[PDB]
Amino acid sequence: VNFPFPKKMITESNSKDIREYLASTFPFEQQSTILDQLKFRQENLAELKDQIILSLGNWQKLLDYTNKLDELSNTKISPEEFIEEIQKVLYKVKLKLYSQFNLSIQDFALQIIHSKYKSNQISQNDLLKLITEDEMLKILAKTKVLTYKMKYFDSASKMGINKYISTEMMDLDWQFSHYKTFNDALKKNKASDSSYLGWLTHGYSIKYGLSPNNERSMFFQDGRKYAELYAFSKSPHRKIIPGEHLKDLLAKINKSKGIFLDQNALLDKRIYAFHELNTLETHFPGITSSFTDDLKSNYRKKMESVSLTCQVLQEIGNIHRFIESKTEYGLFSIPKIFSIPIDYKHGEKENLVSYVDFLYSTAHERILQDNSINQLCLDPLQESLNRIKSNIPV
Amino acid sequence: TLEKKVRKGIESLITELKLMQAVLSKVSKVPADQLDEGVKIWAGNVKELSYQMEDIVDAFMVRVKDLHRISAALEEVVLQAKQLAELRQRYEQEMRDTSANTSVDPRMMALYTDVTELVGIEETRDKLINMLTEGDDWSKHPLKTISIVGFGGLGKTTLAKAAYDKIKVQFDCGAFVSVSRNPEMKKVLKDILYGLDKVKYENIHNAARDEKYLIDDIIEFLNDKRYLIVIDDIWNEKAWELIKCAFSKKSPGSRLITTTRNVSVSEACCSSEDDIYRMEPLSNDVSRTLFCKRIFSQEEGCPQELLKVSEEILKKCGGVPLAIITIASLLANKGHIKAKDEWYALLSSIGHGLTKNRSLEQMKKILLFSYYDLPSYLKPCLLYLSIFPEDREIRRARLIWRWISEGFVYSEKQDISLYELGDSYFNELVNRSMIQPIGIDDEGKVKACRVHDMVLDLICSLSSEENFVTILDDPRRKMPNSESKVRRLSIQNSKIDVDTTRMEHMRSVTVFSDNVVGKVLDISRFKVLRVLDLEGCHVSDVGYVGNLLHLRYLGLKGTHVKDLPMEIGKLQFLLTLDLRGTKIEVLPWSVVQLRRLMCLYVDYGMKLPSGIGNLTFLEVLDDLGLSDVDLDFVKELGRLTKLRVLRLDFHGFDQSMGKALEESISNMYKLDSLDVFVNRGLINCLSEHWVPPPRLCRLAFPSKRSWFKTLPSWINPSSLPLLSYLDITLFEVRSEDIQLLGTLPALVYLEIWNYSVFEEAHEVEAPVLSSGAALFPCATECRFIGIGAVPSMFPQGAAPRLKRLWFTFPAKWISSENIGLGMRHLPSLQRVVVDVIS
Amino acid sequence: TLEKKVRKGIESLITELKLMQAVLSKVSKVPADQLDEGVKIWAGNVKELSYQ
Numbered sequence A: 001v002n003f004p005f006p007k008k009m010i011t012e013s014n015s016k017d018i019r020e021y022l023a024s025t026f027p028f029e030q031q032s033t034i035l036d037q038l039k040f041r042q043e044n045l046a047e048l049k050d051q052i053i054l055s056l057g058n059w060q061k062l063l064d065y066t067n068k069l070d071e072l073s074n075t076k077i078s079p080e081e082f083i084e085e086i087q088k089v090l091y092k093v094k095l096k097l098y099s100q101f102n103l104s105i106q107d108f109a110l111q112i113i114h115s116k117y118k119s120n121q122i123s124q125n126d127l128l129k130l131i132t133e134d135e136m137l138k139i140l141a142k143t144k145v146l147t148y149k150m151k152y153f154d155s156a157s158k159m160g161i162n163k164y165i166s167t168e169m170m171d172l173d174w175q176f177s178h179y180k181t182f183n184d185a186l187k188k189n190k191a192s193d194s195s196y197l198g199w200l201t202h203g204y205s206i207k208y209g210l211s212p213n214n215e216r217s218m219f220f221q222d223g224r225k226y227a228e229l230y231a232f233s234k235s236p237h238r239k240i241i242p243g244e245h246l247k248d249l250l251a252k253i254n255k256s257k258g259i260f261l262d263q264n265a266l267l268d269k270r271i272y273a274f275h276e277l278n279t280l281e282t283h284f285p286g287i288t289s290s291f292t293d294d295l296k297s298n299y300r301k302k303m304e305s306v307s308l309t310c311q312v313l314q315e316i317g318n319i320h321r322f323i324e325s326k327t328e329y330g331l332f333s334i335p336k337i338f339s340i341p342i343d344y345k346h347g348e349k350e351n352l353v354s355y356v357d358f359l360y361s362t363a364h365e366r367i368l369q370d371n372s373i374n375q376l377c378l379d380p381l382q383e384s385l386n387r388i389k390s391n392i393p394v
Numbered sequence B: 001t002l003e004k005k006v007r008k009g010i011e012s013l014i015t016e017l018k019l020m021q022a023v024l025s026k027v028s029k030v031p032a033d034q035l036d037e038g039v040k041i042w043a044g045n046v047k048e049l050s051y052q053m054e055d056i057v058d059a060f061m062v063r064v065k066d067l068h069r070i071s072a073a074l075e076e077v078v079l080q081a082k083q084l085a086e087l088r089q090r091y092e093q094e095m096r097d098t099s100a101n102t103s104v105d106p107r108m109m110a111l112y113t114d115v116t117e118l119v120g121i122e123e124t125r126d127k128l129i130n131m132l133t134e135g136d137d138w139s140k141h142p143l144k145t146i147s148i149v150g151f152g153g154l155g156k157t158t159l160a161k162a163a164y165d166k167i168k169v170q171f172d173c174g175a176f177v178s179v180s181r182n183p184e185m186k187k188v189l190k191d192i193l194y195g196l197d198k199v200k201y202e203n204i205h206n207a208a209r210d211e212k213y214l215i216d217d218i219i220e221f222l223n224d225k226r227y228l229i230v231i232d233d234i235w236n237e238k239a240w241e242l243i244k245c246a247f248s249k250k251s252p253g254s255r256l257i258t259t260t261r262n263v264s265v266s267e268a269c270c271s272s273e274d275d276i277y278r279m280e281p282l283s284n285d286v287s288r289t290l291f292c293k294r295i296f297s298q299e300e301g302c303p304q305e306l307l308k309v310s311e312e313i314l315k316k317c318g319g320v321p322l323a324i325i326t327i328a329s330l331l332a333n334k335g336h337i338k339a340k341d342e343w344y345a346l347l348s349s350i351g352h353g354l355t356k357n358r359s360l361e362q363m364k365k366i367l368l369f370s371y372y373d374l375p376s377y378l379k380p381c382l383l384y385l386s387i388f389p390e391d392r393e394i395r396r397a398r399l400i401w402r403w404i405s406e407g408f409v410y411s412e413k414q415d416i417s418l419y420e421l422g423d424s425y426f427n428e429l430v431n432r433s434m435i436q437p438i439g440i441d442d443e444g445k446v447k448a449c450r451v452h453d454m455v456l457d458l459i460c461s462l463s464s465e466e467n468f469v470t471i472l473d474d475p476r477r478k479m480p481n482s483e484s485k486v487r488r489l490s491i492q493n494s495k496i497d498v499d500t501t502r503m504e505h506m507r508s509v510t511v512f513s514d515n516v517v518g519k520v521l522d523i524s525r526f527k528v529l530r531v532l533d534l535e536g537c538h539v540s541d542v543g544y545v546g547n548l549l550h551l552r553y554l555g556l557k558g559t560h561v562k563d564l565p566m567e568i569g570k571l572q573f574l575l576t577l578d579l580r581g582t583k584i585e586v587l588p589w590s591v592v593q594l595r596r597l598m599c600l601y602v603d604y605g606m607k608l609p610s611g612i613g614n615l616t617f618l619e620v621l622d623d624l625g626l627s628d629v630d631l632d633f634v635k636e637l638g639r640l641t642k643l644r645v646l647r648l649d650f651h652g653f654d655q656s657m658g659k660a661l662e663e664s665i666s667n668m669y670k671l672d673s674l675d676v677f678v679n680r681g682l683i684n685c686l687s688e689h690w691v692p693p694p695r696l697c698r699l700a701f702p703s704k705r706s707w708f709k710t711l712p713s714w715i716n717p718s719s720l721p722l723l724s725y726l727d728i729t730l731f732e733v734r735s736e737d738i739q740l741l742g743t744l745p746a747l748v749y750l751e752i753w754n755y756s757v758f759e760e761a762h763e764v765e766a767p768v769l770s771s772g773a774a775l776f777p778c779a780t781e782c783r784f785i786g787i788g789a790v791p792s793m794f795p796q797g798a799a800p801r802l803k804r805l806w807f808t809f810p811a812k813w814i815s816s817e818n819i820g821l822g823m824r825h826l827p828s829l830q831r832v833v834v835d836v837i838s
Numbered sequence C: 001t002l003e004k005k006v007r008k009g010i011e012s013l014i015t016e017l018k019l020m021q022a023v024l025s026k027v028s029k030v031p032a033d034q035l036d037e038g039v040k041i042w043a044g045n046v047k048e049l050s051y052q
């Protein structure tokens, strides 16, 4: 079906028309809108050992640490000892089905700290004194991508949104709702470490296949890169007259910038070049400030236009993951008692299909159009618009 | 027994070599115009036989079945030597009446050219005038020289004469005298005398007194006068020092000018760099005007369709005011005799076949002058540049390793580690004004090199008439008429004719940015192979090297190599092993089996097996990954004391193991550079009580997240006074650390990071250079991070040479009086944008 | 085998040629008055061999 543009308008006395339902419904509680409860995971903490006991026969350490995590989940311990208690397994484990339970061991344990932090049980300074540690940075930068790929990638690939997975656009997921603190508080206190951890995170994302390629990544998986990255982060006059091991980086930046500005060449490699490039400026502002070339190519607006496309597709995929469930929510994400049955809900007809029109009108309201942008924005948006209007009634 | 006969023939063979390179060195000195063709043909056959015997001797040396093969080969080679012996005798004559006149100087007619013909010579003649005539006022300043170095024909005599024609009426004497490649000193001095007075010295070329009395005469004639002599085309400065003694008296108000093609002889003059006058290629606009002055009558836009051809061709010459003259005179016999098609043919011709033309060889002599003046053991080095493509920068390290692996570097002094010898070769090539250097690598030396285009094709042809190299180019698309006698092959863009049938004795092979490798070409068929170069390819199949035994150089930079065979231990002879940019992440255990190496450009991601200490001869190691290492392996690194450069990064041994290696460093004494990389930590490696190696020049530190507590004590002007590079980062800072560092002799490069300023809440203080006056004789590059370096550390007489300075400046000091700038310092200290902090 | 020896003699013969035309080109430059007759006879004979 060639569905046309749903021309609508989100104005005053209309944002609250749907957001009021969205402010209390099961989804969107841990998310936001571009137009702008502890029992839920406690039950998962209870079910943490559903299938571990089935095949304990090698497979004993899983249950051995499972009951320890269950104990530490509900027991009240002072912050200056709770970190030591929980790190006893964090600093112990090293590494098919095993890793599956191993990730749940790490993922559920770390969520406890945020749960106690939002309750003001753990002092902010105490958390600050530990987050700066180097090892847990690479622990989180690994567990986040592993947890995302193990559950959501299987359903994302079928929808065709796998090619539009954005590492930087990951905190908005409802399940990974605890990362706003780790991002914003760390940025406010230690700004450099935020860019450092994002740089580390994208390196594994490249290596684990989030943005796969057959050619090496000359910007990640090497400490000497961050040396210059942090060297220019403190001096405003180092790009004008660069030094050695800095001309090469600029050459590889502008070569990929020209690849992105091209039209005829292959699209998947352009998507690949998008991810690291977008990661570069957000963490390191003023790094590709080609004041001349960007103006005669509308590059500054083009990057934002192609960035908003992935943001729209994320929420579209969320709606698709919500419609069929009414497990695409992902393993160990929603417990069985809190699950969602098959019956159609009356509030969907007034807050979902109408809200899709608002989303597409918001998508098609301020994005520029170009022959390069059309292959990057217009075509995926039209494909998603066609796919979203062929499954709502059914 | 049987081996005894072979080994007793080998020394006879090597003596034969020695004589044959003697003869070939003798013949190649003379230009190939006075050389009779019979001797030329004989010499070519001599060279081919030389290759054959070198092959036999290398094969025998590598091996010790084979004895019989070696025997047959050596006997038959003796047979061709014997046969070729009397061919020269059989057909040869004398011709007592063959006295053809000596050739005249090809660049004398150029001296006689119209004044109102040269364009753009201005604003350089005036600058050279006033860079020496500024002292002509108060004409009592002591005499000085101003040399002019340059390459090819960028125009030295022209500008020298131009300056020689304007300011003369204010002088009493003067002489413009030339010198050839092999001058006659008495002839030169007679030339000088005739240039002063032609009346008393009209027949001064007749009398043959001696080298000395005429020197006394010229010394006597030069009293109480200002002479302003100019002498041009001086090569091999040993000649020049004779003339300088002729000017040995105090003479206020006189100066002299020199020109040469070697910068390595001008520093022997004028005792100072401010008197050295470099000359540059002309600008694009001036070059365009000059180019259109010749071919076009008065206007340029009438073609309007070959314009892009004009810029494209003029780019090939670059700025040379001789190449463009040649092309303009060749390209139009009478008013655009040709248009837009043969122009493309000409453009395609350059690089492979443009030189062979008419009225064009009259200028190639001027270029081959420099090549002929080269001593031996350097002609192969210059001719080796034809392998690489037309416009591509060449890293000098690759060149040096290729030369050493080939076998063009050798000596019998035993005081040279054989790498700095190749470096000396490279520097000699550079200072002869024959290669352009660019950039500075992580070695503290020049990064890469580039070759002029019309010299590149010229040397390509010169190496092409013999079998020194072979090129497969689309514009060329030519192959020698003998597939057998191919030694060096330099594959390029062409990917069609990749035949490999009849090169059994393939010395070396290289591929440049081509996917044709592998799918069409086979290397394993090469029974012998000296060096292998495959950087930039996209093939991971290199596991057939076990069939190769003579390999020396193995370049695999950016090759997508996943793994390399376990059978590499068979390569006892090897000099280089580069693996940077490869997918392989672990090395096979069969590397301790190896015995000889000097460099190992390994990736720190890859794993180094135990027993590394056995590679005693190893001389440079790069990017070693030090993680999860046991103590004995670390201590092995102190055993092999031959390093000059070492690069280290690590993440997983921050223990007392750092101190264990810390003294193990001091076991080596040949270091030149060092650097250590570690992330965001206090440096738990270096103690304050550890003697450093006596020789250190660079001593870098790449990491900026890590820090030292304070300035190390073992850094002192006493130990290691050879530093020209600092690159430090540390937590605190002291106004006395700068005072300590201002005592070291050279410290050309300075870069200091104050960790606490940009990490912790701290105010950038103002350190004070308390003691001394200058503390910085030659520190051109100084970098201060988080440290306030106001211009008023001292008056201008503190750092004579400082082109660049970086520091931080608070906004609260704007109203203060500690920023009292406004004066011009001694170096070019006028381009600065300080990082200001609110 | 047998053809190998012949073909390995051919290039030697070619070199012999090249030397002979070198010599003949050298001698023919001078006018035939300053040339001594022994050299002339030798030149004629080598020319005939060159044809063969």
Ligand SMILES: Nc1ncnc2c1ncn2[C@@H]1O[C@H](COP(=O)(O)OP(=O)(O)OP(=O)(O)O)[C@@H](O)[C@H]1O
Pocket: B107, B110, B113, B117, B118, B119, B120, B121, B150, B151, B152, B153, B154, B155, B156, B157, B158, B159, B232, B233, B259, B261, B290, B321, B322, B325, B366
């Ligand atoms: N401004 C100019 N306009 C035209 N031709 C020029 C100009 N400057 C130089 N040339 C040309 O450059 C050549 C001069 O060569 P140059 O002065 O370098 O000679 P040199 O010192 O004897 O030796 P070499 O050429 O080996 O350096 C001549 O061909 C001359 O015509």
